[PDB]
Design a binder for these strands. Structure first.
Lengths: 49, 49, 79, 1338
RNA sequence: CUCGA
């Protein structure tokens, strides 16, 4: 009924009032690890690797 | 208004964990500071809750 | 092999009463009259396996079988 | 004052005079292990009782025995400084002198055959360090206490809840220290029942027939006989008036000539007084009144027939006719009253199916051992060994002392076994409770709950370890060969060293030590757990055990506990509370003799407290001692009310004895709540020690006792003058009168520099004295991690304003200025430990080489010749610390790669890189590298120079140990020789070794010169012995785990600043997450230019009622106002008579202050050192319930030219306008906390799937993904998002042909779901199909 | 088992 899933993360939450109602912050060192195959697929398409 | 009463007026009537109401009340509030026995009486309700 | 284990364990029981310190294999081979690598070979066979449902803290929700990584899988970047 | 208290005198606001100082806070851990090791010939604590109870054991046939003589604890093989290095248990080998004797076969009592006496080794015991911290496998472990039921007797009663319509059933237990639990209980049919060891129910008089009692003696023991008389065919009874008291007069009560009582009469007490008045001896009664009376004896037919009736049979008219026929003039009946003397045993004796003794032991046998056919010889032994054996039952002198007291006996000493007088007394008291006299007891009385410390639990484990070898050696002595049997061979070191090492290291009470404070170390040892063996659990504890009983006052703290699932179970010992000799909790009081409160102190238990009347500590007092207010408030019998002066028997010691030690550091505890003041004491236990310590401006005066007694500072044993100060060692010259007559008089303290704690924080002792200054006894010479001139100092204090600032402090958030980040106020130091172990595979051994395949020069720049990283090299995430390669068995190859490796000549060998790398997101600096290696393995180049540096340091440290000590010894020689023989230059110009050669004339001075000479002669050889021992300890090969070649250990040193995410918290339970690090110019600033370092939130005060922080803020503002007045008066460099004119005016501003400090007796140089330590702010003490009032804060704020309201007019930073209202600004002592954000952040795309279930692992150190539990599966079902639910079950987690297709689709640039059945479903199919249940699909 | 929400 409940599994452990890939493409996942965990961090401490903090308040920020400059956002809009549909936005949220995200660290760079977290989105670099969650979006890694998307980054590979974009780096191969532009010929950068 | 139930928590401003515990800052100027007196604490109402604490109750020992048998369920019976203690006779003498906590006549001192959180600005004037509680007594030694009035702080020990005030721990039955907080530990219960 | 059980006799070779039990001679080592009887001699290692006697050496603790005699010397007072736990015997290293180098001084154990002197009593056993054996090469030291033989005694290091016999001291590897033992220690019957741990159950995979044993708890490794003092808990009861974290068993040992939730820590064993599967190694036979091919990596998704290497595939 | 002393000399070390003449810097930074903490101004006290306390008004109550203290009569007793705070005792040694670690008294329950150290004084309870000293009664486990030291030999006791008379009291039998510890190992001596455990030996003398089991030994002397004899042989089976009674032809030999093992006698016990004595034991002896050898020297520990290693010290504590290297047991934390090599990872071995800091223990002491236990030896014992045993005496085996052989008794002759044919001789009647023949002892003279042979006496064999030999010393036997048996296991080890782990010693205790000087703070209560056992060292098990290198990690420091602390055993907490336990709070369990005391042995004895216990009368309990359910309030209802079993049967309808009330009918409370009074049960009664007997709890021994070891054995079965005898139990009694009633029934709704008012019978009695016995439950031996919580088995099935049994009629209670079957344990009376087993004690060799007939049913005549059983009725005699419990009841009260009424004798009848039959003379000349008259039915006249005897009657004492005390029996007939409160019944219905269903007939006429008569006398010779005065009818005393009416008919139909509720018989009043005045009737009983009038019947008592004249005489009542013989009253004629109707015959029908006898019909309804049970007989007592066994009235038989004496002439011819058998018995007419036996005991416990009701007399009817025919049986009475038969008794008058056979002839009887004494008929005894049981006085059965309906309300006062119930017939409970008389009803039990009929439901009882047994009749005899040999038919009642069979019933106990068939209750306890069902399904086995009983014989008599095995039925007697079960009931004998159940209760009345010297090994299978034990109350052990606490159950006896608490057993004789509830039955109101007189003796205290008694046998550990039961008797046939204790069970009848228990049944009599239970029946008396059922009748109406006496009262039922309670379980939460703290005179019914003991404390069971370390030396009591290790002894009970040692006895089990002794029995596990007594079982073998009992049968070894009847196997034969009693001719050449020296007693060393029979006893093996397996079971005792298994049981002791199992307790020290695997129990629920031998837990890991929290070492990230001096406070958190000291409040983990005064912790009274209630769980563990013989206690409760977290799923079977209601609201009744977790509650604050009224006898917790002054023994166990009410506001120091965890708040998780075990909220009331983990208690905490109070400040002044001691442990009794039995185990109960006693607390001190002052005696009140005729209205004069004296100064002699009495320790009172929990049962002695509820009989007196005891005053509060807040009662007022005159000079000589008299209650001034003439009507005081007091406690008596668990309740509280007003009383008079002459009635009072006792008084509390001080106002700190109700709270714990971890909660008496909070200032203004009297103003807070009880919810938030709990989390203000749970979160003071987690403060990380910062870079440089800083004293708290508003303390409670308890900061001085916790720093000294925690064993984290370096205190001076003897007093004198400091001779040499380094950053590592401190050499102190002892004063003259504090010396011993065979010493050299130099104490050397070696401070411990940067090491690793258990919570991976720093430990570092800096000296605090200067070169050439006097030091008295018991001062603080070296402040540890969170100490500051001997004061405990966990966090740092900074400016705080209470205003909402653009939402950045929204819901308990904290907005931190940049000058907290710049000035290094909160930057902590963490020390990690990384280990790379090179094991032995079967395909050749592994190797640590600088050569690494498939890695260029850019990672091997910091690796040395031998392959281990340099000390002091700055590393980053991913860089290689130890280059270790492992051999790989040859594998098959895919054909296109086989084409590639024929196009080019690349042929990678069987080598394979599996080296140790720094984990990601970590900077640091390698500050320590340790290399262990197995015997018979050739060392590297680095492993040799490590050992050579250790040899050089062991040379240098012992040489400097000898040099300065000899230099002091020669001056001690010169001090006697110059006064004796005046040779100022003959002593000098000689060779300095020829002072022992020089000789004064025949006096005692020459004799003490010879004493110092023989001291030097001992010193010249103990250095050589210690040098040889340290050389043999260093150069020897190390012990290792089997299958290990060598182990490298690398110690990083991570320094961490504050980030957005780091949990910060005050002392009053106001937590927070740092949200934004502003620039300096954006913070609100007052009209003097100073910016505000923290902008807190003011909406957190009225919802939680912690108004302690506002008063602490105002008092901190007053303290820093005074401390800036002194800084202005020092920066002008005015005088020294001006500082004495002001600081003296600052040190007395209370009404009735305790301390009186005058700066007249201070010299004109000590005032400058004092005012140099008050430049940062005058420190202020405020005790717990003796606090500083609101008038004193306003009287102190007017001294340093500050606003009385405490609120100033802040200007904005951004726009430059000023706010409308004034804003509260002051100082709050802010802590850091161990929940940093660098250890919580974690992200994972793909890797390391599990073995059986093939779904990814769990844990940040395991690199696992978060759990998408069914609480979220319901929440995704409710949205209707079925395509996000199909993805988070198959293609993300559990499929095998699903993930590696989705990865190619995503890298290829085509997000398309490709489903499949999960692998966890066709493991469920195989595990249902293995039960013989055919389950398929269609 | 201890800790955090």
């Amino acid at each position: 009924l409940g599994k452990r899933v890939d493409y996942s993360g965990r961090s401490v939450i903090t308040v920020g009032p400059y956002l809009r109602l549909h936005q949220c912050g995200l660290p760079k060192k977290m989105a670099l690890e969650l979006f890694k195959p998307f980054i590979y697929g974009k780096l191969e398409l532009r010929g950068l690797a | 208004a139930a928590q401003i009463r515990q800052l100027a007026g007196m604490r109402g009537l604490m109750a020992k964990p048998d369920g019976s109401i203690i006779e003498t009340p906590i006549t001192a509030n959180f600005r004037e500071g509680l007594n030694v026995l009035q702080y020990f009486i005030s721990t039955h309700g907080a530990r219960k809750g | 092999m059980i006799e070779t284990i039990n001679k080592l364990n009887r001699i290692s029981r006697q050496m603790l009463q005699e010397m007072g310190r736990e015997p290293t294999p180098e001084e154990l081979a002197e009593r056993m009259l054996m090469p030291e690598d033989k005694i290091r070979k016999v001291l590897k066979i033992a220690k019957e396996p741990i159950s995979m449902e044993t708890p490794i803290g003092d808990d009861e929700d974290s068993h040992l079988g939730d820590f064993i990584e599967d190694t036979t899988l091919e990596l998704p970047l290497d595939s | 004052y002393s000399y070390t208290e003449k810097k930074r005198i903490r101004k006290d606001f306390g008004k109550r005079p203290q009569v007793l100082d705070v005792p040694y806070l670690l008294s329950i851990q150290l004084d309870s292990f000293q009664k486990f090791i030291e030999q006791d010939p008379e009291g039998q604590y510890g190992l001596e009782a455990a030996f003398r109870s089991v030994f002397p054991i004899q042989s089976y046939s009674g032809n030999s025995e093992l006698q016990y003589v004595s034991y002896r604890l050898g020297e520990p093989v290693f010290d504590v400084q290297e047991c934390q290095i090599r990872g071995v248990t800091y223990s002491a080998p236990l030896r014992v002198k045993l005496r085996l004797v052989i008794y002759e076969r044919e001789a009647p009592e023949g002892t003279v055959k042979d006496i064999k006496e030999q010393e036997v080794y048996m296991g080890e015991i782990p010693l205790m360090t000087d703070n209560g911290t056992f060292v098990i496998n290198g990690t420091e472990r602390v055993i907490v206490s336990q709070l369990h039921r005391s042995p004895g007797v216990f009368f309990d009663s359910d309030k209802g809840k079993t049967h309808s319509s009330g009918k409370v059933l009074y049960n009664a237990r007997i709890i021994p220290y070891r054995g079965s639990w005898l139990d009694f209980e009633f029934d709704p049919k008012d019978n009695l029942f016995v439950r031996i060891d919580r088995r099935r129910k049994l009629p209670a008089t079957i344990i009376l027939r087993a004690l060799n009692y007939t049913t005549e003696q059983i009725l005699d023991l419990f009841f009260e006989k009424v004798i009848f008389e039959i003379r000349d065919n008259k039915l006249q009874m005897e009657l004492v008036p005390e029996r007939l008291r409160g019944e219905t007069a269903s007939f006429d009560i008569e006398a010779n000539g005065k009818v005393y009582v009416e008919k139909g009469r509720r018989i009043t007490a005045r009737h009983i007084r009038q019947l008592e008045k004249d005489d009542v001896k013989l009253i004629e009664v109707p015959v029908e009144y006898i019909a309804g009376k049970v007989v007592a004896k066994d009235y038989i037919d004496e002439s011819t027939g058998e018995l007419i009736c036996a005991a416990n049979m009701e007399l009817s008219l025919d049986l009475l006719a038969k008794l008058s026929q056979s002839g009887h003039k004494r008929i005894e009946t049981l006085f059965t009253n309906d309300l006062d003397h119930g017939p409970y045993i008389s009803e039990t004796l009929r439901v009882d199916p047994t009749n005899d003794r040999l038919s009642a032991l069979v019933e106990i046998y068939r209750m306890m051992r069902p399904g086995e056919p009983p014989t008599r010889e095995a039925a007697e032994s079960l009931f004998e060994n159940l209760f009345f054996s010297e090994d299978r039952y034990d109350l052990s002198a606490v159950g006896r002392m608490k057993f004789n007291r509830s039955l109101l006996r007189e003796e205290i000493e008694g046998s550990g076994i039961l008797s046939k007088d204790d069970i009848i007394d228990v049944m009599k008291k239970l029946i008396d409770i059922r009748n109406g006299k006496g009262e039922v007891d309670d379980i939460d009385h703290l005179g019914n709950r003991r404390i069971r410390s370390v030396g009591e639990m290790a002894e009970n484990q040692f006895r089990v370890g002794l029995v596990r070898v007594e079982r073998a050696v009992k049968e070894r002595l009847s196997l034969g060969d009693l001719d050449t049997l020296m007693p060393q061979d029979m006893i093996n070191a397996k079971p005792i060293s298994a049981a002791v090492k199992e307790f020290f290291g695997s129990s629920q009470l031998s837990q890991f030590m929290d070492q990230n404070n001096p406070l958190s170390e000291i409040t983990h040892k005064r912790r009274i757990s209630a769980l563990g063996p013989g206690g409760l659990t977290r799923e079977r504890a209601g609201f009744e055990v977790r509650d604050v009983h009224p006898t917790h006052y002054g023994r166990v703290c009410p506001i120091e506990t965890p708040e998780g699932p075990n909220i009331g179970l983990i208690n905490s010992l109070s400040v002044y509370a001691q442990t009794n000799e039995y185990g109960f909790l006693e607390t001190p009081y002052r005696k009140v003799t005729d209205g004069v409160v004296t100064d002699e102190i009495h320790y009172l238990s929990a049962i002695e407290e509820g009989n007196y009347v005891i005053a509060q500590a807040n009662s007022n007092l005159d000079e000589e001692g008299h209650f001034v207010e003439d009507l005081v408030t007091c406690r008596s019998k668990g309740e509280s009310s007003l009383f008079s002066r002459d009635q009072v028997d006792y008084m509390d010691v001080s106002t700190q004895q109700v709270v714990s030690v971890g909660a008496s550091l909070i200032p203004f505890l009297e103003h807070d709540d009880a919810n938030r003041a709990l989390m203000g004491a749970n979160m003071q236990r987690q403060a990380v020690p910062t870079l440089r310590a800083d004293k708290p401006l508003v303390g409670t005066g308890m900061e001085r006792a916790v720093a000294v007694d925690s064993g984290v500072t370096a205190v001076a044993k003897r007093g004198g003058v400091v001779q040499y100060v380094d950053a590592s060692r401190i050499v102190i010259k002892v004063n003259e009168d504090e010396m011993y007559p065979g010493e050299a008089g130099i104490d050397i303290y070696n401070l411990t520099k940067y090491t690793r704690s258990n919570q991976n924080t720093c430990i570092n002792q800096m000296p605090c004295v200067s070169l050439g200054e006097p030091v008295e006894r018991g001062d603080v010479l070296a402040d540890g991690p969170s100490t500051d001139l001997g004061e405990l100092a966990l966090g740092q204090n900074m400016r705080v304003a209470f205003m909402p600032w653009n939402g950045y402090n929204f819901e308990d958030s904290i907005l931190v200025s940049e000058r907290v980040v710049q000035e290094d106020r909160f930057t902590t130091i963490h020390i990690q430990e990384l280990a790379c172990v090179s094991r032995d595979t079967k395909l050749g051994p592994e190797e640590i080489t600088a050569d690494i395949p498939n890695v260029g020069e850019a990672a091997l720049s910091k690796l040395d010749e031998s392959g281990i990283v340099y000390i002091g090299a700055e590393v980053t995430g991913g860089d290689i610390l130890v280059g270790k390669v492992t051999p790989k068995g040859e594998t098959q190859l895919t054909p296109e790669e086989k084409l590639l490796r024929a196009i080019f000549g690349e042929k990678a060998s069987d080598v394979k890189d599996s080296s140790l790398r720094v984990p990601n997101g970590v900077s640091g600096t390698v500050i320590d590298v340790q290399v262990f290696t197995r015997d018979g393995v050739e060392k590297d180049k680095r492993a040799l120079e490590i050992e050579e540096m250790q040899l050089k340091q062991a040379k240098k440290d012992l040489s400097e140990e000898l040099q300065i000590l000899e230099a002091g010894l020669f001056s001690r020689i010169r001090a006697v020789l110059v006064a004796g023989g005046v040779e100022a230059e003959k002593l000098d110009k000689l060779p300095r070794d020829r002072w022992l050669e020089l000789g004064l004339t025949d006096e005692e001075k020459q004799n003490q010169l010879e004493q110092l000479a023989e001291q030097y002669d001992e010193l010249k050889h103990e250095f050589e012995k210690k040098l040889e021992a340290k050389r043999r300890k260093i150069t020897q090969g190390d012990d290792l785990a089997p299958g290990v070649l060598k182990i490298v250990k690398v110690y990083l040193a991570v320094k961490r600043r504050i980030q957005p995410g780091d949990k910060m918290a005050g002392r009053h339970g106001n937590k927070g997450v740092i949200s934004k690090i502003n620039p300096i110019e954006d913070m609100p600033y007052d009209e003097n230019g100073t910016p505000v370092d923290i902008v807190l939130n003011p909406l957190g005060v009225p919802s939680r009622m912690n108004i302690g922080q506002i008063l602490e803020t105002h008092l901190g503002m007053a303290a820093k106002g005074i401390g800036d007045k002194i800084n202005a008066m020092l920066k002008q460099q005015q005088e020294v008579a001006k500082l004495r004119e002001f600081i003296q005016r600052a040190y007395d501003l209370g009404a009735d202050v305790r301390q009186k400090v005058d700066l007249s007796t201070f010299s004109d140089e000590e005032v400058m050192r004092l005012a140099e330590n008050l430049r940062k702010g005058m420190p202020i003490a405020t005790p717990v319930f003796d606090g500083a009032k609101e008038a004193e804060i306003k009287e102190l704020l007017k001294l340093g030219d500050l606003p009385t309201s405490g609120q100033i007019r802040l200007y904005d930073g951004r726009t430059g306008e000023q706010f409308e209202r004034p804003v509260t600004v002051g100082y709050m002592y802010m802590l850091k906390l161990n929940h940093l954000v660098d250890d919580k952040m974690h992200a994972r795309s793909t890797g390391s799937y599990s073995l059986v279930t093939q779904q990814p692992l769990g844990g940040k150190a395991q690199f696992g993904g978060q759990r998408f539990g069914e609480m979220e599966v319901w929440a995704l079902e409710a949205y209707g998002a079925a395509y996000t639910l199909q993805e988070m079950l198959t293609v993300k987690s559990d499929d095998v042909n699903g993930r590696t297709k989705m990865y190619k689709n995503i890298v290829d640039g085509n997000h398309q779901m490709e489903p499949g059945m999960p692998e966890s479903f066709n493991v469920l199919l195989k595990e249902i199909r293995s039960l013989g249940i055919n389950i398929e699909l269609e």
